[PDB]
Write an enzyme that holds these catalytic residues in place. Structure first.
Site, PDB file in Angstrom:
ATOM      1  N   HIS A  71       0.768  -1.187   0.035  1.00  0.00           N
ATOM      2  CA  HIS A  71       0.020   0.018  -0.186  1.00  0.00           C
ATOM      3  C   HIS A  71       0.755   1.247   0.131  1.00  0.00           C
ATOM      4  CE1 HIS A  71       0.044  -0.192   4.481  1.00  0.00           C
ATOM      5  NE2 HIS A  71       0.527   1.116   4.338  1.00  0.00           N
ATOM      6  N   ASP A  95       0.113  -7.779   1.530  1.00  0.00           N
ATOM      7  CA  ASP A  95       0.395  -6.030   1.493  1.00  0.00           C
ATOM      8  C   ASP A  95       1.981  -6.241   1.751  1.00  0.00           C
ATOM      9  OD1 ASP A  95       0.493  -3.301   1.763  1.00  0.00           O
ATOM     10  OD2 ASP A  95      -0.616  -3.257   3.817  1.00  0.00           O
ATOM     11  N   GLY A 151       3.086   6.591   8.780  1.00  0.00           N
ATOM     12  CA  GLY A 151       4.498   7.001   8.231  1.00  0.00           C
ATOM     13  C   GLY A 151       5.348   5.960   8.799  1.00  0.00           C
ATOM     14  N   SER A 153       4.555   2.553   8.533  1.00  0.00           N
ATOM     15  CA  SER A 153       4.382   1.318   8.158  1.00  0.00           C
ATOM     16  C   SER A 153       5.567   0.951   7.207  1.00  0.00           C
ATOM     17  CB  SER A 153       3.387   1.368   6.986  1.00  0.00           C
ATOM     18  OG  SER A 153       3.599   1.653   5.707  1.00  0.00           O
TER      19      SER A 153
END
Ligand code: ZN
Ligand code: ZN
Lengths: 645, 645
Positions: A71, A95, A151, A153
Site C-alpha cells: 500500500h 500487503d 508514516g 508502515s
C-alpha cells in the site's frame, strides 16, 4: 518513479533496544533520484526511511531482502546504484513487497525464540512496546493517536533479542486511538520468498475432479471470455460468463454466433435472451438480481474482469465465491489481463505521445492541437460530466463533430460511423463497445473514500485523483486493437492497482439493501468469501462495521427509496434513509442540493435542525445529534477499525 | 527558496468571463527554480499559479505589480529571469505582498464601473459569481465547502468588464461551508502604489502633544529597553517599560541603576520594588495583574519585544492600546528588533555552520561532533523537554557537563561561566539572560493550532513545526553578542514571521478568565484594540466566536482552576472547566493523561462516559454529548468564521 531511501533508523542491540534516525537525502535529491532510479548513496543499517514524492514510510531488510508494504510502495522500482531495482517479490494479498538488498545492506535475522514481548520501531526512531496477541497482531501497552503511527508502515516488530518478528502494516483503532497494531509476520515472508514465481496461468484451467477456484491471466483479446468458454462447452460443460459491461455482455451474442457458432443466453437488466444454449453471458448486476447461483445450472463460472473494483462486481464475485460450489460448479475462474500488482507496459501498436502546451484546445493544463482530432474517430476521457460538456461544446463551436457521453445519456449519442470526437467519462466502459483512431487521457478519476470523522459519525468524500494502472490500461485500450493507435496524455504517472477503499464496501451493503433484497448479514457472508480469496483486489476488512451500521437502518420509506433508485445516485439507500428520518420529524434535509430532491416537494413544510445520520456532502443546515438512529450509528463508531499507516 | 510560477489561468477577452489553465512547470522544475530564484521561462497572462516547496496558490498582476497573499508568500523573493525579485511591497496587515512584475507579465487594471456583480477566479480555472457586500467582502451565490476555494488565495475578484476589484484572501464559513469571501480591495493596492516603499522607524520618537502610537524597530542591544527609556526619563517624563520575561525585566532595573543612574520601580510577580523613580520596569503579566493603566501614572509606555505572540503579551499590549490614552499617556512605543514580515539576515558576529551527518551525537536526523562542544559554554535548542532530558543524559555520558532546562525548573544553569552545555527548550529566554560561545538549533518548535473539527466542537492540537524567523533570530541571538559566536543549524529554512493562530486568542480568553478576573466581553475590548492597531503580529478575527464559548463556561470549580493555574499547563481554564463538568457528573476525564491529574485522586469514584466539551488531546474514554455545555458550545460553532485559503 522509484521509491528512494531518504534516511535510516539506527538501532542498538546492546543493553535495551534504542534507536535514532539519520536523514541522508533532501527533497531535491529525493525527487531527482526518484525520477532517475539511480541512487549512488550507500545504504547502511537494516531500517531504511523511504519516500515516493507523495508519501514517506519505512523499509526493513531481512535475510537479504529489503521489504515494505504494498500500500505504500505499490509495484515501484527501488532507486539503486546501477539503476532502478525492480521488485523481487510482490504479494498484494500480504500487503508485502521486496527488493534484492543493496550491497551496503546489513539485514536482520528472523526471531527464533517465540517471545510475545515485542518492540515497534517507528519512523521517529521511537521504540514502543507491544504484546503479541496473535500471529499477526499486537496490542500497544499504551494506546496512542493513529497520527503518531502514521508514516511508520514497513517498520520492524522486534523480539527482545533484537530479531525480526514482522513489519508494521496497519493500526487497530477505537474512535481514532490506536490500541493494537497489525503486521506481516516474518513467516509470511519466508513463504513469499519461496512462492513459485514466473507463474504463468495464461491457459484455461482444466476443470478439476473436485471444486477449485482458478485464476487465468491473459492479455486482452486472448479469448478469455469467448475462445475459452467455447472450448469448455465443446467438452460438454455448461458455462456461465460474468462481465461488468452491459454493452459487452449484449455484444457476445453476435460475436459468439459468428466466431464459434454458439448462440448463448444473454442476461442484462435491459434485456435477456434464453436460447437454451450451454453457455450463458451475464452482467454481475443482473446475476445478482437473478438471485445469484442457481443449483445445478453450471459446471464452470468465469468471472471476467475480476480486477474491476466497482461494488457490483465485488458483490457479484463474492456471491459466486460463496455459493458456486454448493450449487454444483466444479470450477470458478477469475480472469483478467491486469491482476493486482499490474503495471502498464508498452503496447507494440500504440504510439504514446505526451501532450504539450501548444495547441488550440486547452486540456487539463496542456493543449490539444486541433490537427490531431479534425477528421477521424477520437476518444477523449475526462474525469467529470461537467468537463465533458464543456469540452464537447468547445469543439462543437470550432466546427468539430463532438459529442459528450456519461452516465445518463443514451449511447445513441455516440455515432458508430464517421468522424467524431467523443468526450467521455469512465461510464463509457459499460455503455459503449467501440475502438478509436486515438485516445486522449486526462489521467485523472473521481473516487470516493470514507472518512471516520466522528462529526458525528462518518463521511463519504468525493475527490479527483491520479488514475491507477488498470484505469490507464483500460483507457488506452480503446485504441490499438487491430489498428495502429495513438494515446496522448497529460501526465505519465500511474498509481498502484489492486486496492480499493472501504467506501466501496459501504456501497455493497447499500446495493444489497436497495436492489438485491440482501440483508446486511447475507451481504457480509458474500463479501467475506471475496476477502478470503487470494488473487483478488484488496481492501481493509470493515465488514462488521459496515454490517452493524446498515443493520440499524430499519423501515426505510419505499417511496424515497424508489426515487433514489430511479435517480441512479451513488448511495440510494443511505440517502433515501436519511431523507426518511428527516421526514419522520418534519426536519429538512442536510441541505437542498440535487442529492436531496426526493424531499423537494415538501420544502415548505420542512424546518428545524436536520437529525444528521452521516455526511454525504455539504451540510448547509443546522443539525441535531439527538435522534435514536444517529446515536446508534454513533455507537457503531466504537468498533475496532483497522486503518493503514 | 523563491516563489516560482508553475502555471497560469488565462481569461477570456470577450463575452462572458471564462477561464482555462496552462501548466508550465512540473515538480522538479519548480523545486530547482525555487532554490536558484532564477526563472528564465517567459511569463504570460495576468493570473499566475505559484508555489513554494510546500504550498500552491495564486498571484495576480495589477498595474505592473504581481500581487499575492502574505499568508502564502511570506517575505519570499519571486523567481525571475535575472535572479530572485525582492518584494516591492509587504503589508502584513492587509495580507498583501507585491513584486514588480517580470517582463512578459500583462496586468489587469482597476475597475471603474463600480458593479456589485463580481467574479472570483480559482486555481482550477473556475469562475464563481459573487455579490459585493462591502469594500472587502462578498457573498457566494452558491455556498461551497471550504476545500473548493483552498489554493485560490491570491486570485482576483473581477467585475463584469473583467477589471480588478480585489484579491481573494479568505473565506467566511459556517460549519465548514463557505458562504462569503474576503478580499483585499483594489483601492488599497492603489494607495500602496502611491506611498513610500521605505519607512523610517529606526529612531525613538519625540513625545507628541497628544497621544500617539509609534513603532520602534531597532537591533538588539540598541538600548530599546535601556538607553531609550533612560533618555526620555532624562528629559522629564514618566516611562513604563513592559517586557515578556521576568528574567529580562529584573535584569534591566538592576542595570539602569548601575549603568544609567537611578533605581527604577520593579514589578513582577516574584519581585516588586517601589522606589519613586520615573521609570518602572514591568512584565506584561504583572501589568495585567495590576489591572492595567493607572490614570496619570505615565507619559510613555514602552511595549518591548512586541513581536512576541504569546498570549500574555498580546493581552498585555491590547490592554495598553485600549487604555493608555484615557490614562493620560502621550506616547506608546511598540518596540522590536524583528517586526512582522521581517526576515533573518547575516550577523557580523556570528559564523553560521550547517550540521552534517558526520558527528558523534545524533541530532534531529543530523549529528554534532563533541569537538564543537568539548570546551566552553554552549546552548543547544530542543523542541521538547523530553529531548533535553535525553541529550543532557547522553551528553553527560560522553563525559560532557550538560544540564537540561525548561518550564518547571529553576535557573539551575551555571552562569559561573564554568564550562557547560545547556540543552534547552524555548523557556530559555524567559528564565535566563546569558549568551554563549556557540548555539546549536534543532530549527523546530512546538505550536498550537485550533481545528474547528465539529467532533463535537473544536480541537486544539499540539504539533511540532519548522521555526519561523523570529525564532531563528532569537535562538541565534543567544550567541555572538559583542564577541565571536558560532551558530550551528539542522536546517536553512525559515517560515514567515508576524502571524499567529486563532488558538492563541483562545488562550487570551482563558488567561483573562483564569488569572485576570476579566469577563470575556472585557477581553474582547482589549483584543479588539490589539487587532485594530497596525504593525503588530496578525491573526484571524475570531473574537466574537471565542467570546461566546467562554461566556457559557460558568460556575467553574474554584479548586480545580486553582490547581491548573499553579501547574503551569496551557489552558488552565478549559482544563479545569472540563474537569468540573466531569467531577460533578462523577464521570472520568477524557483520558488519564497528565493534563487531567487534578482528578487522579477521584479515580476510584469516577465511572461512565465523559461529557466531552471540546478536544484538548486524545480522548480514550467513551463520551456522551448530552451535557448542556457541550450543546451550547456546539451552537457556538455556527458563527461566521473566517479562514484563510
Ligand atoms: Zn527472538
Ligand atoms: Zn468594472
Amino acid at each position: 518513479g522509484s521509491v528512494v531511501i531518504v534516511g535510516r533508523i539506527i538501532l542498538s542491540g546492546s543493553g535495551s533496544i534504542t534507536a535514532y534516525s539519520q536523514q541522508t537525502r533532501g527533497l531535491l535529491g529525493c525527487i531527482i533520484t526518484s525520477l532517475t532510479g539511480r541512487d549512488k548513496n550507500q545504504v547502511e543499517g537494516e531500517v531504511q526511511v523511504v519516500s515516493t514524492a507523495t508519501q514517506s514510510f519505512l523499509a526493513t531488510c531481512v535475510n537479504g531482502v529489503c521489504w515494505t508494504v504494498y500500500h505504500g510502495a505499490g509495484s515501484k522500482t527501488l532507486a539503486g546504484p546501477k539503476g532502478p531495482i525492480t521488485q523481487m517479490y510482490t504479494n498484494v494479498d500480504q500487503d508485502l513487497v521486496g527488493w534484492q538488498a543493496p550491497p551496503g545492506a546489513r539485514s536482520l535475522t528472523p526471531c527464533t525464540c517465540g517471545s510475545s514481548d515485542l518492540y515497534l520501531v517507528t519512523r521517529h526512531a521511537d521504540v514502543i512496546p507491544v504484546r503479541r496477541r496473535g500471529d499477526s497482531r499486537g496490542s500497544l501497552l499504551s494506546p496512542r493517536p493513529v497520527s503518531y503511527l502514521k508514516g511508520s508502515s514497513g517498520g520492524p516488530l522486534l523480539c527482545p533479542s533484537g530479531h525480526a518478528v514482522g513489519i508494521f502494516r496497519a493500526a487497530v483503532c477505537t474512535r481514532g486511538v490506536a490500541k493494537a497494531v497489525d503486521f506481516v509476520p516474518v513467516e509470511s515472508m519466508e513463504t513469499t520468498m519461496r512462492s513459485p514465481v514466473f507463474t504463468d496461468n495464461s491457459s484455461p484451467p482444466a476443470v478439476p475432479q473436485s471444486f477449485q477456484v482458478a485464476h487465468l491471466h491473459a492479455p486482452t483479446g486472448s479469448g478469455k471470455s469467448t475462445k475459452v468458454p467455447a472450448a469448455y462447452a465443446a467438452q460438454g460443460y455448461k458455462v456461465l460468463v460474468l462481465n461488468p459491461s452491459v454493452a459487452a455482455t449484449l455484444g457476445f451474442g453476435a460475436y459468439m454466433s459468428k466466431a464459434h457458432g454458439i448462440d448463448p443466453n444473454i442476461r442484462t437488466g435491459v434485456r435477456t435472451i434464453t436460447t437454451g444454449a450451454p453457455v450463458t453471458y451475464s452482467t454481475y448486476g443482473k446475476f445478482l438480481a437473478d438471485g445469484g447461483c442457481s443449483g445445478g445450472a453450471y459446471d464452470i463460472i468465469i468471472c471476467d474482469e475480476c480486477h474491476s473494483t466497482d461494488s457490483t462486481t465485488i458483490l457479484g464475485i463474492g456471491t459466486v465465491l460463496d455459493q458456486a460450489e454448493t450449487a454444483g460448479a466444479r470450477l470458478v475462474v477469475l480472469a483478467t489481463a491486469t491482476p493486482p500488482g499490474s503495471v502498464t507496459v508498452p503496447h507494440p501498436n500504440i504510439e504514446e505521445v505526451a501532450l504539450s502546451n501548444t495547441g488550440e484546445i486547452p486540456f487539463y493544463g496542456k493543449a490539444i492541437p486541433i490537427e490531431a482530432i479534425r477528421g477521424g474517430r477520437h476518444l477523449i476521457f475526462c474525469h467529470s460530466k461537467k468537463k465533458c460538456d464543456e469540452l464537447a461544446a468547445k469543439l462543437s463551436g470550432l466546427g468539430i463533430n463532438a459529442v459528450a457521453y456519461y452516465r445518463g445519456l443514451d449511447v445513441s449519442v455516440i455515432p458508430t460511423i464517421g468522424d467524431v470526437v467523443v468526450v467521455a467519462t469512465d461510464a463509457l466502459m459499460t455503455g459503449y463497445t467501440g475502438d478509436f483512431d486515438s485516445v486522449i487521457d486526462c489521467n485523472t478519476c473521481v473516487t470516493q473514500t470514507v472518512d471516520f470523522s466522528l462529526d458525528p459519525t462518518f463521511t463519504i468524500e468525493t475527490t479527483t485523483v491520479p488514475q491507477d494502472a488498470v484505469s490507464r490500461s483500460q483507457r488506452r485500450g480503446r485504441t490499438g486493437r487491430g489498428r495502429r493507435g495513438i494515446y496522448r496524455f497529460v501526465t505519465p504517472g500511474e498509481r498502484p492497482s489492486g486496492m480499493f477503499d472501504s467506501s466501496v464496501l459501504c456501497e455493497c451493503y447499500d446495493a444489497g439493501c436497495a436492489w438485491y433484497e440482501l440483508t446486511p448479514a447475507e451481504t457480509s457472508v458474500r463479501l467475506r468469501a471475496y476477502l478470503n480469496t487470494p488473487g483478488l483486489p484488496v481492501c481493509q476488512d470493515h465488514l462488521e462495521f459496515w454490517e452493524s451500521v446498515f443493520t440499524g437502518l430499519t423501515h426505510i420509506d419505499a417511496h424515497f427509496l424508489s426515487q433514489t433508485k430511479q435517480a441512479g445516485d451513488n448511495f440510494p439507500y443511505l440517502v433515501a434513509y436519511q431523507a426518511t428520518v428527516c421526514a419522520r420529524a418534519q426536519a429538512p434535509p442536510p441541505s437542498w442540493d440535487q442529492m436531496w430532491k426526493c424531499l423537494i416537494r415538501l420544502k415548505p413544510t420542512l424546518h428545524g435542525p436536520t437529525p444528521l445520520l452521516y455526511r454525504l456532502g455539504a451540510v448547509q443546515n443546522e443539525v441535531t445529534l439527538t435522534h435514536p438512529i444517529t446515536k446508534y450509528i454513533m455507537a457503531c463508531m466504537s468498533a475496532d477499525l483497522e486503518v493503514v499507516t
